[PDB]
Amino acid sequence: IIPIPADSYTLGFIGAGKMAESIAKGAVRSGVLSPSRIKTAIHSNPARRTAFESIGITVLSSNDDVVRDSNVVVFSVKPQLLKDVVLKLKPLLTKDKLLVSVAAGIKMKDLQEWAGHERFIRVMPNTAATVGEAASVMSLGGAATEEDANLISQLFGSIGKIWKADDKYFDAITGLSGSGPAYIYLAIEALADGGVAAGLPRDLALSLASQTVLGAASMATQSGKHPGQLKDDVTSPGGTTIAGVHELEKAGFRGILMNAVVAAAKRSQELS
Amino acid sequence: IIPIPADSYTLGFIGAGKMAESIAKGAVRSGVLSPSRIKTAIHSNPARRTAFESIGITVLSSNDDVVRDSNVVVFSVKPQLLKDVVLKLKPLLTKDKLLVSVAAGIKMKDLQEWAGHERFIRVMPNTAATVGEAASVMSLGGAATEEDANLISQLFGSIGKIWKADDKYFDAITGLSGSGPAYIYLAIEALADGGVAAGLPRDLALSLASQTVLGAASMATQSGKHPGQLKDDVTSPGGTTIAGVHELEKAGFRGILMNAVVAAAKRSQELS
Amino acid sequence: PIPADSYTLGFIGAGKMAESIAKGAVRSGVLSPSRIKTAIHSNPARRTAFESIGITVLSSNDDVVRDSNVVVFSVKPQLLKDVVLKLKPLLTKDKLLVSVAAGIKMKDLQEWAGHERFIRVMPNTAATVGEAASVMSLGGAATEEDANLISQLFGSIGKIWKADDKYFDAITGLSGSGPAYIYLAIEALADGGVAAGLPRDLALSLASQTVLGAASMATQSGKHPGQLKDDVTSPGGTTIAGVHELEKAGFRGILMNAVVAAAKRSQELS
Amino acid sequence: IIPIPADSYTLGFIGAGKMAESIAKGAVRSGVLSPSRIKTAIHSNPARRTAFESIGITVLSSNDDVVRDSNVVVFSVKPQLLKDVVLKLKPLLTKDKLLVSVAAGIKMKDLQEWAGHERFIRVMPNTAATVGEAASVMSLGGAATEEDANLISQLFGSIGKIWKADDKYFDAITGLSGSGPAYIYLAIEALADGGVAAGLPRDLALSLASQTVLGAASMATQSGKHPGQLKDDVTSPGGTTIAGVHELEKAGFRGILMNAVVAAAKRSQELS
Ligand SMILES: NC(=O)c1ccc[n+]([C@@H]2O[C@H](COP(=O)([O-])OP(=O)(O)OC[C@H]3O[C@@H](n4cnc5c(N)ncnc54)[C@H](OP(=O)(O)O)[C@@H]3O)[C@@H](O)[C@H]2O)c1
Ligand SMILES: NC(=O)c1ccc[n+]([C@@H]2O[C@H](COP(=O)([O-])OP(=O)(O)OC[C@H]3O[C@@H](n4cnc5c(N)ncnc54)[C@H](OP(=O)(O)O)[C@@H]3O)[C@@H](O)[C@H]2O)c1
Ligand SMILES: NC(=O)c1ccc[n+]([C@@H]2O[C@H](COP(=O)([O-])OP(=O)(O)OC[C@H]3O[C@@H](n4cnc5c(N)ncnc54)[C@H](OP(=O)(O)O)[C@@H]3O)[C@@H](O)[C@H]2O)c1
Ligand SMILES: NC(=O)c1ccc[n+]([C@@H]2O[C@H](COP(=O)([O-])OP(=O)(O)OC[C@H]3O[C@@H](n4cnc5c(N)ncnc54)[C@H](OP(=O)(O)O)[C@@H]3O)[C@@H](O)[C@H]2O)c1
Ligand SMILES: [Cl-]
Ligand SMILES: [Cl-]
Ligand SMILES: [Cl-]
Ligand SMILES: [Cl-]
Known about the structure:
Chain C: Residues 9-103 form the Pyrroline-5-carboxylate reductase catalytic N-terminal domain. The structure is cut from a larger assembly and holds 4 copies of chain A. By secondary structure, chain A is of the alpha/beta class. Chain A has 2 domains: 1-173, 3-Layer(aba) Sandwich (Rossmann fold), CATH 3.40.50.720; 174-272, ProC C-terminal domain-like fold, CATH 1.10.3730. In chain A, 52% of the residues lie in helices and 13% in strands. The first copy, chain A, has helices at 18-30, 47-53, 63-68, 79-89, 108-115, 146-156, 170-178, 180-197, 202-222, 227-234, 240-250, 253-271; strands at residues 11-14, 38-41, 58-60, 72-75, 98-101, 120-124, 134-140, 160-164. An 8-stranded mixed beta sheet of chain A has the order 3-2-1-4-5-6-7-8, sandwiched between helices. In chain A, helix 4 (79-89) runs parallel beside helix 5, helix 7 crosses helix 12 and helix 8 packs across helix 9 (202-222). Chains in contact: A-B, A-C, A-D, B-C, C-D. Chains C and D meet through strand 7, strand 8, helix 7, helix 8 and helix 9 of C and strand 7, strand 8, helix 7, helix 8 and helix 9 of D. One chloride ion (CL) binds next to helix 11 of chain C.
């Protein structure tokens, strides 16, 4: 358990997919890494090779070589393939290398058991990694150090925001930040459909809907205020906003969103 | 109707309130204007003086002096005060000066009638102007030129996005982009409440809820995809997301949001 | 100007609300009983109610008006117009007039009296225990000092704010009518406790005090109600389970509906 | 089992948190205790030291010292920490010291077992302790005396009202007076939103909502009347109040509150 060199470490991705590509691009963009400090290896699809090579990243010929050449190893394969991937690599997974999993639904207890050591960090990012606005949460294995956590905080900070939490919260996280973007995609479409129903052109309705949601969320993220207070700030007496708000409350809007999170969290738990 | 010099016009705010401050800051930040080209005047509250002076802007002693010194005049008082404010200034409202209203709910027909001429642009911004993410729409009076419009686009482009539309769409705009932020504040709170109901800490639930919404909206704004495509991208077969989405659909989530927009737009119309 | 420390107050309509205001003003020292007058109508039990507080009961409404710097109209609303018309010669501009009548607008008050030195107040039922929510509106000739005087008076029986007359239908639906919404809530909470196995007496005692406490927190804490709700909803706990039931059912929207309906009814009546 | 000296006993808090601070302040305010008769010890957060010292209370260096110096010991740590805290202190928990737990959801049977004796009182307060308007209930362990009960009644009388009940009622007490304040916070916000929907300014709507609720509860507390009679007193024929009440009854308002108490009480039982 030697500290990973914060400014010069090399990063390897096992599973050269979309999430790996997003993280790589983000980290290159933010200057946290350069392409020469990133490695991956393809599986069956040769189009993935091109994706990485075109951003300056070297694609090695096996998972084993990626691990050998890396200080930090990110496992970014589909969850149901992760166990075998880790077991095959296990002789190379020495405690001087920080391991990271972004696999949905795979618990730290299992990660540590497969790898045979506890210098492991789990991250649950979300789809908005692609635009640098992921909501990510990390949980630390028994031997991950504070400096390991800072390294991962800086890396994932390059594709959005990143918070820390106990591993036991990750089913609920999955139902909220993991699954939530679909709730808001529905909301955006519905708001646009509402605009069109009220007489607006469809291109404008959609443009407004998307930017309205973006603006409101940016207020919530930057203002330091409770969402109730933000709502209070915009509801003028007897005005349009409160008329719309009343329709939401008549229908139990808040309880519907709560239901969705809860159902999604419960599903996460059922899928293990 | 002399063209307003694009690179040298002076801007005046009538009503030195929150929205004026947001616009002024934005325009100074973007480099559209320098503080020396902006003027305003205080009403009763001397704290507003400080707000403007601290960004380098000169506070004159009356609304009349602001108008005299300005090529472009933005009316940013509360809507129910606007008529008397304009009537009092009318003699100074010569046709060489471009007039702009940001007042919610006040139609172009009335603006033009109060001012006595048609070189008037209406804008409807929203509350996210404070963080530079407003959704704004402008409509042009009968004598507003294409160059006048470009000037106003550039100015409102500095506090978010800005689109153009006929005045007859403004009730529906008001119900969607004007009132919509409250719908999303409710959504954010409810997502957080859902997280807590599924066992998350509050501080984390709320941070995730806000950043989830922000991220999803960023994906909608940048991806070029229809919201249904985005929803398809994240709903993996039999997974957590589609479980949550199904709960939303069982309850008619989309129709509830449509209802809110339609009701808000109908209220806008009823208020005039 | 009405002498702030020495004025005399008259009640026209010696009912419950007049009694509550009289007691509260006596208790706070804003008035003494010797500075308050009223007159009975038909019920002689009202005489004993006022006399037992040290207040003189005069023999007619006319005498009450003559002897008073400030005149509070505290008869039922449908009786107010005739009462004011009968007294109109005595309603001189040196006397401040006040109505606590539900649903009667300032425009009508001023028209019946023939002048504009008139203040309207909408209190509520909790005046009885010194916890009213009250709002005042000022007629066209009511002065700032007149307003202060009324604030002091209604500050003795609860809280008092100022608002334009045009808000009073909505006020009536919220603070006027709202107590009944809470009485339902209290009963329901108790019934819920009994349904979960609690003894009735204890269920009811807990319900009332839980509501009292929560409202005291909202009043004193300086926090938004959402923040207060956040403070008590621990992760996966009992509180968020209960809140989730409320939200599934659209609890908030139901209370909104009640306020809106009540306000609409106020407008329709008035 | 020596009686605790009613006028001179010393009180110790284990767990120097919010509830401990509320109880301390209430007891000082009412004159039941003086600050010199109260002791506590901090854990990790030194801001808690300042909170108690600023009330005149001595902060000792360990839990063990607090116990040694106290006749009455109040356990005010989070419930999931309580078992270990009591086990560690057990050698000092002699029968001459009255023990009290304010921990939510921890039964008398377990308390007695952990401490190794039955001179134990359980109290369930609620959040309004902060303003002296808690609804609290106590249950008595097998060796708690009448004089012990009077001592606790007096103590908790200083932060609200306090009743006695068998331990088997506590899941339902938790769902009603423990959780109930949230139900009322929703109600207060909803009433305010309703005011705004009916045309009121926000500040006034919220002020009125809060005081209306406070008033009505004071009437219920002081009047000696059944809530149905209080409702009958304010519902004039065909008037505004009955119009509002009818909307409540149409929607099954009473059943919804009953549902919330029941669900909360059931959750309490499930959490143990
Ligand atoms: N995508 C998101 O937005 C998001 C959000 C949160 C979490 N995640 C998590 O991120 C992980 C990756 O998702 P993704 O969307 O990027 O998946 P993906 O695009 O399908 O990428 C997975 C890659 O792994 C490769 N692979 C399969 N077997 C392999 C092996 N034995 N060794 C090395 N590579 C192998 C696949 O290549 P072939 O196709 O050639 O077999 C594929 O390129 C998942 O566990 C997911 O739960 C994703
Ligand atoms: N805020 C938003 O998010 C938003 C969004 C869309 C549209 N709008 C619109 O923008 C306008 C301004 O809103 P706002 O929130 O900025 O309001 P605000 O902050 O209250 O600003 C109003 C300002 O006008 C001043 N004022 C009052 N009477 C005046 C007079 N006769 N002459 C000059 N100034 C006077 C007020 O001063 P005193 O307080 O000192 O009297 C105050 O500084 C409104 O029409 C609103 O509909 C706002
Ligand atoms: N009580 C509240 O909580 C509350 C809340 C808000 C507003 N208000 C308003 O306050 C007003 C009074 O209500 P209240 O509940 O006190 O009514 P109340 O108890 O019935 O008393 C009104 C009194 O007026 C008397 N009266 C009838 N005709 C009269 C006349 N011509 N001259 C003088 N007095 C006459 C009645 O006499 P008899 O005894 O002979 O019948 C009665 O004692 C109402 O307008 C109500 O809307 C009350
Ligand atoms: N708050 C309420 O309204 C309310 C209502 C009813 C019941 N209760 C109950 O009252 C109890 C306390 O709640 P609370 O809100 O007051 O919690 P709190 O504010 O978090 O207080 C807990 C305190 O215990 C300390 N602590 C942790 N481990 C300790 C140990 N081993 N020895 C001594 N102290 C330790 C903590 O210190 P650090 O900060 O350093 O960790 C903290 O100061 C809970 O059991 C709760 O169920 C609370
Ligand atoms: Cl509005
Ligand atoms: Cl999914
Ligand atoms: Cl809880
Ligand atoms: Cl009524």
